[PDB]
Paper text:
Nonribosomal peptide synthetases (NRPSs) are multi‐domain enzymes that catalyze the biosynthesis of therapeutically relevant natural products. The communication‐mediating ([name]) domains facilitate interactions between separate NRPS subunits. For unknown reasons, [name] domains co‐occur with epimerization (E) domains, are partially embedded within the adjacent condensation (C) domains and can also be found as internal cis‐[name] domains. We present the first crystal structure of a cis‐[name] domain within an E‐[name]‐C domain arrangement from modules 4 and 5 of bacitracin synthetase 3 ([name]).
We selected the cis‐[name] domain between modules 4 and 5 of the [name] subunit including its upstream E and downstream C domains (termed E‐[name]‐C). Recombinant selenomethionine‐substituted E‐[name]‐C was purified by Ni‐NTA and size‐exclusion chromatography, crystalized and its structure determined by SAD phasing at ∼3.3 Å resolution. In the E‐[name]‐C structure, the cis‐[name] domain appears as a small globular domain sandwiched between and partially overlapping with the E and C domains. Both the E and C domains adopt their canonical V‐shaped structures. The cis‐[name] domain shows the helix‐hand arrangement with a helix‐up conformation, in agreement with the revised upside‐down helix‐hand model. The helix packs with three hydrophobic residues (L5076, I5079 and Y5083), which are conserved across [name] domains, against the palm of the hand motif, for example, the mostly hydrophobic central residues of three β‐strands (I5091, V5160, S5148). Here, a seam segment (aa5056‐5061) follows the last helix of the E domain as a mostly extended polypeptide chain, which then turns to fold into a lid region (aa5062‐5072) that closes off the [name] domain structure between the N‐terminal end of the central helix and the first β‐strand of the palm region. Together, seam, lid and helix represent what was initially defined as the COMD domain in trans‐[name] domains, and all these segments make extensive contacts with the E domain, including salt bridges between E5060 and K4934/R5056 as well as between D5065 and K4937 and an interaction between D5074 and R4931. In the E‐[name]‐C structure, the E and C domains are oriented such that the PCP binding sites on both domains face each other (donor position on the C domain).
Residue numbers in the entry: 4618 to 4978, 4988 to 5287, 5307 to 5349, 5355 to 5386, 5396 to 5437, 5454 to 5461, 5469 to 5488, 5494 to 5513
The structure:
């Protein structure tokens, strides 16, 4: 999909930063590489490869022109001057390194942004090989872009030398499209939600080293660079046996050493630095730039304040956590500063130091010259670059002479090396690996809060921690609001007939626990700010097995009913105790009684049936010595993560406008023809059977309006929802060709069927008086099964409606039901 772009392109924030800092001597600031080929460079081939390279990476042709102080960036067409190629013969000089350097430096300052092409070349010829110089202005290339250029040139040169036409890989999204993409993202509400974060990162300035106030503008001519290194032994410890202490990365240790060094000399536990990101991860789902050539570097500040904490074991954790809390990898700050132009953002203090860790690591031996001008202004007095060349960490320290003296910077570099060694030895000698809140998936937990959760659940390994779903949160809030501690219990008794191996049933039961993590979850609401699901790794639940075969069935039933009464009396204390309890008692040889109790938070009735079915399937596979066949279970955390993904402020808007205004049972069976007739009416109107029956109930309510309907809550766009275990059941209110009109009412709420009823009625005038009732629509061993106003309807050949009320009025309810479901059909 090769294309070509031409015309105005918006300035990316990195480009806008370049023009703001550099107002004079902006002509030459380049990215230069020297290459050596033993057999020599064919002048015909190199000028043809670069001709195709430039028109394939359209950023290289762009031009920056000025109009009364404003900068307009234009992308030139392929027909204009693409590059300048110069060829030199330094074979006979006998002082080639001197001659090539002076030639390369002169050509490196010849770039005119307004007129000249931004790519210029210099081929040097020697009797012992040829050298090619590639100079590209930094406004159209970065570190990753040159890696792309090298691959295309290597493929292009090899294939062109073999006679074939040059054809590169298909072009990705243009830099012009990328610039317009981030500019559109500049006014998105998602980015503007990060203003308070970046305000904190720039609110205060760090004194750091003693700086000369009269340094003026920091420049390249006033900047010196020296490097310090760690020996191989200590560098080996950092790479291998350091990250294991707290599950950190190499960048965490180096940044921590920066704070430790500043802590020892400045006395403050606060440090502000600027970090460089490659800026190639898409901010919003859309344009990708995997192969696009351009300047995608994104700079953002990070301000770390540890208060009074000096225990460096704690320091490493909270420094790692602070780096884990940067939103969108820091791309937001650059967009917010230059594309949104927030005045508060533009007034932040300058970061005293710029830090960047490149990572781990034919080429020519001749220098390419100075790639930057002496008049180029640099916004950071200090720059630190850390690289491991062979096996040793080389710390390249760049400082401005006018800002800091040489001895001061070398002193800072030396004790930063000492501070780094202090951090390395602390992690190397660490015995046990300490997990961090970001490692558990929830970075909203403080270090102390995690320790209390660990302390509360001591003796148990925590697997994952994530917040409760809004369905679970509503359940817990009225669970603490004691409703006699009876509405939160789901207790059933299921007897089964057959010969059961006790260990296999327990093992099959435990395999269910591992399969569904929510059953192993314990609710935490006191330690954390919000209720949070704490999942224990090896949390088992004991299936207490008592035989009691040798007694009368009436005597057995007395013990069975006593246990059902006794365990219901116990309740759920939520004191770090499992919320699932099951008992297996053996009435006789092939007749058991299995009772199951659970808290409403963990699962619903739909999930309850799934567990029983999976338990039935897996156990029989155990008997046959054949592995079970079953779909992979999707974690309940994925649904919660999706739930937190989409915003529900519009969901609140949806419901607020919608709302503007002794146990007895009875069974009603209708003729099969009557049930069949209304089903035909639903099909002809393209209206669901749920919708048509809602209208028939709604019209009656007008004579006595909005009523409550129970929904599975399993329509979310998460894979495997229908077969995953969790709390998805919900009751939602519905307000009432009429069947067609409310048919689209159901689909409008389909997107917003995820919030609890208690918060929906808060948007209503009647509040708790909104709903008076609910409407419900429905060799081994074998199974067998044994509000105060709810209505249940069961479809089938004959319509059956079961109504429970906690007397002749009931007859009147039935009589009017059948009389009104007759006139409309005819």
């Amino acid at each position: 999909s090769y294309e070509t772009v031409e015309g105005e392109v918006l300035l990316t924030p990195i480009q806008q930063e370049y023009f703001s800092l550099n107002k004079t001597d902006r002509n030459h600031y380049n990215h230069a590489v020297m290459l050596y080929r033993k057999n020599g460079f064919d002048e015909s081939i190199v000028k043809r490869v670069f001709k195709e390279i430039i028109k394939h990476h359209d950023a290289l042709r762009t031009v920056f022109t000025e109009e009364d102080g404003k900068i307009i960036q234009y992308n030139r067409g392929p027909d204009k001057q693409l590059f300048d190629l110069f060829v030199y013969d330094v074979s006979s000089e006998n002082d080639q390194p001197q001659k090539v350097y002076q030639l390369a430096t002169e050509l490196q300052q010849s770039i005119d942004i307004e007129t000249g092409p931004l790519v210029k070349l210099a081929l040097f010829k020697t009797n012992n090989g040829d050298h090619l110089l590639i100079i590209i202005h930094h406004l159209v290339v970065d570190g990753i872009s040159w890696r792309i250029l090298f691959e295309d040139l290597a493929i292009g040169y090899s294939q062109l030398a073999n006679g074939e036409k040059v054809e590169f890989y298909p072009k990705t999204a243009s830099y012009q499209a990328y610039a317009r993409h981030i500019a559109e993202y500049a006014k998105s509400v998602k980015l503007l939600s990060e203003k308070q974060y970046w305000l904190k990162a720039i609110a205060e300035g760090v004194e750091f080293l003693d700086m000369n106030e009269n340094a003026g503008a920091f420049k390249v001519e006033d900047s010196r660079t020296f490097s310090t290194e760690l020996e191989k032994e200590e560098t080996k410890r950092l790479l291998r046996e350091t990250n294991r202490a707290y599950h950190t990365e190499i960048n965490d240790i180096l940044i921590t050493a920066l704070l430790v060094a500043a802590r020892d000399m400045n006395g403050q536990n606060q440090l502000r630095i600027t970090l460089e990101g490659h800026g190639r991860e898409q901010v919003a789902d859309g344009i990708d730039i995997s192969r696009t050539v351009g300047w995608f570097t994104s700079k953002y500040p990070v301000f770390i304040d540890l208060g009074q904490e000096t225990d460096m074991s704690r320091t490493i954790k909270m420094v790692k956590e602070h780096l884990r809390n940067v939103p969108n990898k820091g791309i937001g700050y650059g967009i917010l500063k230059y594309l949104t132009r927030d005045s508060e953002i533009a007034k932040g203090a300058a970061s005293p130091i710029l830090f960047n860790y490149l990572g781990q690591l034919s080429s020519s031996h001749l220098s390419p010259g100075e790639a930057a001008g002496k008049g180029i202004t640099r916004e950071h007095p200090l720059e630190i670059n850390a690289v491991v060349f062979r096996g040793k960490l080389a710390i390249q320290t760049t400082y401005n002479t006018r800002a800091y003296s040489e001895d001061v910077v070398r002193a800072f570099a030396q004790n930063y090396k000492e501070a780094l060694k202090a951090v390395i030895r602390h992690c190397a000698e660490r015995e046990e690996t300490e997990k961090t809140p970001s490692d558990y998936g929830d970075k909203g937990i403080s270090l102390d809060q995690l320790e209390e959760i660990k302390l509360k659940y001591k003796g148990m390994e925590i697997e994952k921690i994530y917040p409760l779903a809004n369905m679970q949160r509503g359940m817990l809030f009225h669970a603490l609001e004691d409703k006699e501690s009876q509405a939160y219990f789901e207790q059933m008794a299921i007897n089964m007939k057959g010969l059961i191996d006790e260990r296999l049933f327990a093992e099959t039961f435990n395999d269910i626990m591992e399969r569904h993590e929510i059953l192993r979850a314990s609710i935490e609401y006191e330690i954390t700010d919000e209720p949070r699901n704490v999942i224990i790794k090896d949390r088992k639940i004991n299936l207490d097995y008592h035989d009691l075969r040798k007694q009368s069935p009436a005597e057995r039933e007395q013990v069975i009913q006593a246990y059902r009464k006794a365990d219901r009396e116990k309740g759920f204390r939520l004191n770090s105790e499992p919320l699932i309890r099951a008992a297996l008692m053996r009435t006789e040889d092939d007749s058991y009684t299995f009772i199951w109790t659970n808290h409403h938070i963990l699962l619903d009735g739909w999930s309850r049936g799934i567990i029983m079915g999976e338990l039935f399937h897996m156990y029989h596979m155990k008997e046959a010595r054949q592995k079970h066949r079953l779909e992979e279970a999707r974690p309940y955390s994925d649904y919660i993560g999706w739930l937190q993904q989409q915003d529900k402020e519009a969901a609140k808007a949806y419901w607020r406008n919608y709302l503007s205004g002794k146990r007895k049972e009875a069974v009603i069976e209708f003729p099969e023809q009557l049930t069949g007739r209304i089903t035909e009416l639903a099909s002809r109107n393209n209206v669901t059977f749920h919708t048509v029956l809602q209208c028939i109930w709604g019209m009656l309510l007008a004579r006595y309006v909005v009523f409550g309907t129970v929904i599975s809550g399993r329509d979310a766009q998460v894979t495997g929802i229908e077969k995953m275990v969790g709390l998805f059941i919900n009751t939602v209110p519905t307000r009432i060709e009429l069947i067609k009109s409310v048919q689209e009412q159901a689909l409008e709420g389909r997107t917003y069927h995820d919030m609890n009823l208690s918060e929906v009625q808060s948007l209503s005038e009647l509040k708790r008086e909104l709903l008076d009732h609910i409407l419900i629509f429905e060799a081994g061993f074998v199974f067998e099964e044994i509000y105060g106003f709810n209505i249940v309807a069961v479809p089938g050949e004959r319509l059956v409606i079961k109504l429970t009320y906690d007397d002749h009025i009931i007859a009147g309810i039935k009589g009017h039901l059948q009389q009104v479901m007759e006139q409309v059909v005819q």
